[PDB]
Amino acid sequence: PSTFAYPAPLEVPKEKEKEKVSTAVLSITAKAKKKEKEKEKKEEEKMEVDEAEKKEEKEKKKEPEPNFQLLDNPARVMPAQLKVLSMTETCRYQPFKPLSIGGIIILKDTSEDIEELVEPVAAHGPKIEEEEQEPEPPEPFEYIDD
Amino acid sequence: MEEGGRDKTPVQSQQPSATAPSGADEKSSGKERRDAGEKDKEQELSEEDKQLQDELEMLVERLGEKDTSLYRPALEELRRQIRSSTTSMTSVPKPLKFLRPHYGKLKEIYENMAPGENKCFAADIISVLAMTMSGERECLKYRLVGSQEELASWGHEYVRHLAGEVAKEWQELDDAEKAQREPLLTLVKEIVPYNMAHNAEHEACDLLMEIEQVDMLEKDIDENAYSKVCLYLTSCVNYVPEPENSALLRCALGVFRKFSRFPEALRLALMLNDMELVEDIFTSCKDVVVQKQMAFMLGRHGVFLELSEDVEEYEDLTEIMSNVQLNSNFLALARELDIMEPKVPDDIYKTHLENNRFGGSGSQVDSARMNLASSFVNGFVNAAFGQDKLLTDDGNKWLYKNKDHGMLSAAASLGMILLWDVDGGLTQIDKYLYSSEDYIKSGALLACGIVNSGVRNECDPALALLSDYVLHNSNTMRLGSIFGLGLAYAGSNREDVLTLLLPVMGDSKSSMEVAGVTALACGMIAVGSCNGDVTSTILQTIMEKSETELKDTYARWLPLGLGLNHLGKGEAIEAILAALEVVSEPFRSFANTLVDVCAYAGSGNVLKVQQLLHICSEHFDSKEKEEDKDKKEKKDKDKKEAPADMGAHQGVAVLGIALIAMGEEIGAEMALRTFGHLLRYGEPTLRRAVPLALALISVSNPRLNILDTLSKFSHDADPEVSYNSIFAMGMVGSGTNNARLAAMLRQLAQYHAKDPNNLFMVRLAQGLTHLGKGTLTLCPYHSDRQLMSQVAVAGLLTVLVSFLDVRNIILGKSHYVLYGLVAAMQPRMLVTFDEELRPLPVSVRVGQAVDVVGQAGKPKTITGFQTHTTPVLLAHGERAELATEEFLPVTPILEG
């Protein structure tokens, strides 16, 4: 369920220009202050000093950004079942995603199947009906909208 | 060279010996390292032993074929070996002998070959071996001192020995705990401070202590032994970080305790400002000879003279404890107490006054805002006996016309002049006390304090009056009253002093800047003496600072009050800083920077590094703004310690002016005010860039602060720097005025500036040394940072003095002649060759009666050996009174 998901809200161009200016002030002042300050005597029996008064020498911070390796297809096959909400999906489906599913059938409600896999983006007929037809709750957008 | 083809002994060599040294010695390289390390097999160590006699002989032929090409390829690897790393320490009988020639090989490479690399490689091998070997090692050094052939090597021989020990590789706990150091001290004195300082151990100071204490009488005489130690300590302190610095001072205090000469001992007790330490030393100064002679006079003058009080009464922390003890021994009641109290110092001031000449009265006009300025100049110029006596006596004219806080101040300033008089001068102060408004009555107490610092015998004490008044309401009445109490009670450790400090009887009833004085007042009681560790003064600071976010001026004063109280040990200051941190305020970050900077001094390592640390592009309050632009001067050390350091830091400082100035336009305005104070606080040897810089900018831009900060420098020596300043201050003053208020500042500075050639001169010396803790400098630093146009400031403003005696009287022995020995000075300089500790004793001769002109002719060496008297006080940073042990009944006086 997590290999095709809904990617984050965007970095955007707008925020990119805006941020650099902000980062610039903090960046020079931190580095300039932090590197220069020592409170250490290295030719002493002590390593540094037992601490007289508190130091300003301090350290930096690192934050990366999350990405998973080079692929254009699912990561992990999966033999577990995952619930799919119709047209919100489990998270999201891409055209390779239904290949990996052996299923695309239902036995998770009253409904059951008369047909098996249908290949990617293609119609399957779920059999809630006797063999003809009966209505079902409205998932489609126009009914909900009006 | 590890070859079994013979280079080493797998069997007894004799063939390569003669042959190899000419071109480049191949035999000894493999023999000493490779054979020793691979086989510590004892049957194989016996072959080497037989070989050993041959090994000795190798040194004379090796000195015959010296030449830089022949010597350079032969040894790089012997230099590298360590005994404990070949583990040849673990057989003592045969390797110890192998070390005896091994040293003799190394010494030629160390000095004769001049490049930096040969010395450093060579250090690591000598130290490890020397400590392990000890006793036999001392014999080994002597053999080398003589030299197998008497050539160039002997001169170098002493330095290399001690230069090698500096490294102190491996063992740091030694094997001997007296070290091999001892014979070298007498021969070379230059190498030794390099060893103690790099080593930067308390253990280093232990080894130095044991050897100087024995060496005192025995080696040569007491006088040279005393001299050797004083120099050594001086390099060492800068290198040690602050917690550890206190420990080295005490260790030193023990070497001195025994010694006939006391000067350096007092400096160490001063640094700490501890009640117990100063007591121990004092009793010890007097004891050596029960006759008054050098011993008592040396102890009494030297400890008492030292500063920690802006008022002229000096310390007085020592005074109460020391006096009862001195009268008990009995050489007379009147003699011990008279020297001890300020009474003798009142005379010597009077006599010096004439030679130096006077800048006239501080009067200008008694009308308009100029009457306020007039009042202030009298106080600033003279904290001693004046020649402006005629204006002060007549109270009605100057004192009354005064407005607002200036009335209180006028009344204070009058006490400064009356100081050195109280045998008739008291009476007016009391008239002022009875009558009129609170400002004048409170002024009279502050003033009384000031006058009653001219005696310790006390007549109609000031101390009684004060007690009842502080308690008494009206914020102006309490403000003056507490501030007075700080002088009057003094640095004393009497219960009377301790008990008062506990309640904050001061201002805390106003949310304005006048309230800040409360923290200052508790500081004023201690006056530079160390903390009792009272909670009340620390807590007060949080309260006052926290409530405003509306006054920039208020927030800064609370840490400034605390610093005065805090002044003392490195040990003590860590503890008091802790209490404040628990709560956090952005206003405290101003205090955090102040306390750290005060604490750090005494170390060139921690102090200078802190002293550039800046973020100022967030706020111009106290929040992130901090002390930084102000701080950039690097003043705290320069005042505290070392003669060399004072010029080096200023060298850094010049460049820093540009950096603030260019960095911001706002930065330039603030930087110019504080830079002008570095000159007064620090006492640099540079007068080039800064006096002129301030002068030119002030013609361009009206800005009144500039004249004020400059005139405080201009007191020091009054036609060196004063030549420029007087011109600038006058020209601006009479071509620009913006207000009556504006005029008032410019006059105050203009009058304060002149007072001819070193009269009640400002120096941050003790005049016995300048390695010690000077007077409270922070009081002019407070007046200089903020606008001096602020009327609230005025009360504090009156004492910003940071004077050093105009005494250059020769004493330190009982003979008590005026105008001391011949000495050396260069006053055609702005940097000088010798600032080791004591400068060059040739230069161009000075022994004149007129007071010394430092800080561009700073160097004084005390010279007296040709006259056959000897100095007890060698120049330790002194700029006042000589101390000698005189074998003459009259001390010669010279022209030059």
Residues of A in contact with B613 (CB under 8 A): 33, 36-37, 56
Substitution target in B124, B196, B244 with the highest count of A β-carbons within 10 Å is B244
- Residue B569 DSSP one-character state: -
As a whole number of angstroms, the longest Cα–Cα distance in chain B is: 108
Mutate to test the interface with B, among A27, A45, A51, A57 (most CBs of B within 10 A): A45
Query: B463: distance to nearest CA of chain A, Å?
Result: 37
- Is there a contact between B243 and A50 if contact means CB atoms under 8 Å apart? yes
Residues of A with CB under 8 A from a CB of B: 25, 29, 32-33, 36-41, 43-46, 49-50, 52-54, 56
Tokens of B432: 């002022």
If one counts every other C-beta atom within 10 angstroms of the C-beta of residue B377, the result is 25
Question: Residue B203: its chain A contacts at CB < 8 A?
Answer: 45
For the record, the structure tokens of B484 come out as 């007075």
Nearest residue in B to A45, CA atom: B201
Number of residues that make up chain A: 146
Interface of B with A in 562-591 (CB under 8 A): 570, 573-574, 577, 581
**Which letter, b or e, does each residue of A22-50 get, where b requires 16 or more Cβ atoms within 10 Å of its Cβ?**
eeeeeeebeeebeeebbbbbeebeeeebe
Interface A-B, measured as beta-carbon pairs within 8 A, has a size of 70
Contact A52 B199 (CB under 8 A): no
Q: Locate B334 and state its tokens.
A: 């009147």
A 10 A CB-CB count for B687 gives: 19
From A92, A118, A90, select the one nearest A104 (Cα to Cα). Answer: A118
Residue B743: CB atoms within 10 A of its CB come to 19
B contact test, residue of A36, A46, A49, A53 with most B CBs within 10 A: A53
Smallest CA–CA separation between B577 and chain A, in Å? 8
Structure-solving method: cryo-EM
Residue among B864, B822, B872 at smallest CA distance from B843: B822
CB B63 within 8 A of CB B112: no
In angstroms, the separation between the Cα of residue B349 and the nearest Cα of chain A is 42
Q: Which position has the token pair 């005896």?
A: B100
CB contact under 8 A, B609 and A41: no
> Do the Cβ atoms of B238 and B638 come closer than 8 Å?
no
Report CB contact under 8 Å: A45, B574. Answer: no
Q: What is the token pair recorded at B649? A: 């830091």
Chain B environment of A45 (Cβ under 8 Å): 172, 200-203
> How many Cα atoms within 13 Å fall on the side-chain side of residue B52?
16
- Other C-beta atoms lying within 10 Å of the C-beta of residue B196: 24
List CB contacts (< 8 A) between B244 and chain A: 44, 46, 49
Q: Per the structure block, which two tokens stand in for B736?
A: 């620009």
Centroid of chain to Cα A70? 16
- Helix (H) / strand (E) element for A113: namely strand A112-113
Residues of B in contact with A38 (CB under 8 A): 605-606, 609
Rounded CA-CA distance B118/B128 in Å is: 17
Other CB atoms within 10 Å distance of the CB of residue B328? 8
DSSP B32-87: IIIIHHH---HHHHHHHHHTHHHHHHHHHHHHHT--HHHHTTT-SHHHH--HHHHT
Burial of A18 (0-12, 13-18, 19+ CB in 10 A): exposed
Q: Alpha-carbon distance B643 to B876, whole Å?
A: 9
CA distances from B664 to B668, B694, B709 (A): 6, 17, 21
Alpha helices in B527-625 (DSSP H): 535-547, 552-566, 570-581, 588-600, 604-610
Helix (H, G, I), strand (E, B) or coil at B882: strand
Q: Is B113 exposed, middle or buried (0-12, 13-18, 19+ CB in 10 A)?
A: middle
Task: Report d(CA B242, CA B233) in Å as an integer.
Answer: 15
Best mutation target among A35, A44, A47 (most B Cβ atoms within 10 Å) is: A44
- Contact, A23 vs A63, CB < 8 A? no
Question: Is B172 near chain A, with CB under 8 Å?
Answer: yes
Q: How close A62 comes to chain B (CA, Å)?
A: 22
Say if residue A110 is exposed, middle or buried (CB neighbours under 10 Å; 0-12, 13-18, 19+). Answer: exposed
String of DSSP letters for B252-272: HHHHHHHSS--HHHHHHHHHH
CA distance B191 to B346: 44
Look up residue B788 and give its two tokens: 């001096």
Q: Which of B127, B605, B626 should we substitute to test contact with A (largest number of A Cβ atoms within 10 Å)?
A: B605
Beta bridge partners of B810: B882
Closest CA to B380 of B310, B453, B427: B310
> Which residues, including other chains, have CB under 8 Å from residue B81's CB and lie 6 or more apart?
B32, B33, B37, B125
Indicate the residue of B241, B242, B613 with minimum beta-carbon distance to A36.
Answer: B613
Closest by Cβ to B610, choosing from A37, A44, A45: A37
Tell me which chain B residues have a C-beta less than 8 angstroms from the C-beta of A56.
610, 613
Do residues B248 and B202 lie in contact, with contact meaning Cβ atoms separated by under 8 Å?
yes
Q: 């232990």: which residue's tokens?
A: B206
